[PDB]
RNA sequence: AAAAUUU
RNA sequence: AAUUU
């Protein structure tokens with residue numbers, strides 16, 4: 001029935017200019033050599049993306065769907081949710097949010113300039129009066145950095161971002177922000193992934209695993225999820241929103257956004273031409289994340305039911321899903337998973353790669369990450385979260401006139417501090433760089449490099465400084481990724497680390513603490529690391 | 537472009 | 544600011 005998009009043939013033009021790497025990358029040329037492999041997805045590539053996501057959806061629901069949808073509305077209605085004042089919504093706007101066509105941007109919105117507020121007032125008026133005229137949206141290519149992979153095609157084409165004008169974005173928040181804060185957790189409970197921290201994610205998975213007599217796990221991800229979302233899914237989304245206690249004024253705003261924006265509309269490129277027409281999710285609207293998550297969850301819980309998955313414990317984040325169930329033997333597990341996929345496929349959520357039962361927690365990947373295990377200081381098993389370092393390393397080498405990658409180095413150091421690739425490679429590089437630069441004291445992304453030990457002890461536990469005996473999968477994957485980007489292998493990073501360590505120690509102060517906690521892995525005779533005052 | 541988590 | 548979807 002529904003085509004996902006149609007296209008005039010106008011191009012998807014760039015919003016800014018898309019910078020090139022330069023013949024010299026002075027921050028990362030000591031980190032890796034293969035700079036030719038590191039690229040940013042361009043707007044020229046958007047054409048290729050559009051072909052891959054334009055297709056005809058058909059959808060066939062069933063008693064299991066209906067049943068799951070019903071139960072989900074009974075959950076929804078134990079929720080009441082308020083409108084947000086025009087003003088409170090204005091100030092959830094991000095500081096750099098793309099400006100409005102009507103002569104103001106986010107500074108004005110956040111400061112409640114009166115031109116901005118009056119335009120927003122009229123926009124909300126029109127939402128309440130007119131509940132049908134479609135609302136124009138802008139279409140743009142997302143710029144992100146990867147490492148080329150010739151196995152899987154060369155370069156990925158850019159994903160498509162589709163969004164309404166700033167005025168409209170504020171009105172969405174007025175109508176729905178409060179819902180986004182309450183509905184998913186109410187509807188999905190413990191299954192709602194975003195509620196958890198990484199530590200909690202890991203623990204939730206181990207508890208789920210431990211409680212099965214005989215566990216089986218898998219993960220699922222939908223190919224081009226936003227384009228698989230049907231008009232009917234979006235209206236069913238509305239009807240889930242409506243099932244809460246709402247002010248009548250919200251209901252009209254919800255219903256109107258739904259019919260005017262969410263289910264479809266025309267799309268314009270940055271130069272103003274009509275680009276095409278859309279009848280799936282616009283990724284760029286306030287409801288993108290909540291919607292995806294709720295919709296994914298309905299389809300998934302139904303498909304579990306269609307396929308016989310026993311005692312499923314779920315975890316859902318957007319279109320990404322893990323299910324840990326009671327195995328019915330491998331012959332049955334294979335068959336049930338094929339059934340799961342058939343169902344999701346009927347529901348219009350077809351797999352990127354077909355899923356597969358697993359019986360070892362390390363082999364389940366979701367949101368480009370997985371759980372792994374090492375040994376702690378006293379020899380106890382320590383479970384932690386990690387990932388292929390390929391992309392983060394490529395992003396670590398993205399230097400342009402307009403972009404430094406140092407913040408990315410730090411981001412990953414914090415998020416993945418227990419991993420062997422952060423501890424040996426990124427930490428070593430980061431500290432080496434700043435020492436020589438003599439900018440340790442300086443803040444970056446509102447964090448002081450010299451706090452890191454406290455920060456990591458707070459977030460990952462003191463065990464992140466003493467972990468050893470990493471897994472084969474993890475050693476293999478790391479070695480393989482450093483070889484792939486032409487970076488030095490782990491032994492060299494051991495040498496560089498000893499030096500960085502010595503120089504930090506002999507600097508005294510917080511540096512020396514950094515050098516002793518972060519790099520104790522690097523010395524032959526360890527120290528005994530005690531908790532840190534600063535952390536509690 | 538939107539959200540969540542981390543800080 | 545970082546990461547993720």
Ligand SMILES: C[C@@]1(O)[C@H](O)[C@@H](COP(=O)(O)OP(=O)(O)O)O[C@H]1n1ccc(=O)[nH]c1=O
Pocket residue numbers: 142221222223224225226227281283284288292318319548
């Ligand atoms: C664009 C999205 O709606 C997207 O389709 C969905 C699932 O992401 P995915 O990583 O599995 O990609 P597919 O589209 O399924 O190929 O998460 C949203 N999403 C994802 C990435 C992003 O920057 N913004 C976004 O709103």
Ligand SMILES: [Cl-]
Pocket residue numbers: 375376377378379380381
């Ligand atoms: Cl231990």
Ligand SMILES: [Mn+2]
Pocket residue numbers: 221222223224225319352
């Ligand atoms: Mn997907």
Ligand SMILES: [Mn+2]
Pocket residue numbers: 238242255
């Ligand atoms: Mn309605």
Ligand SMILES: [Mn+2]
Pocket residue numbers: 221222318319320548
């Ligand atoms: Mn996904």
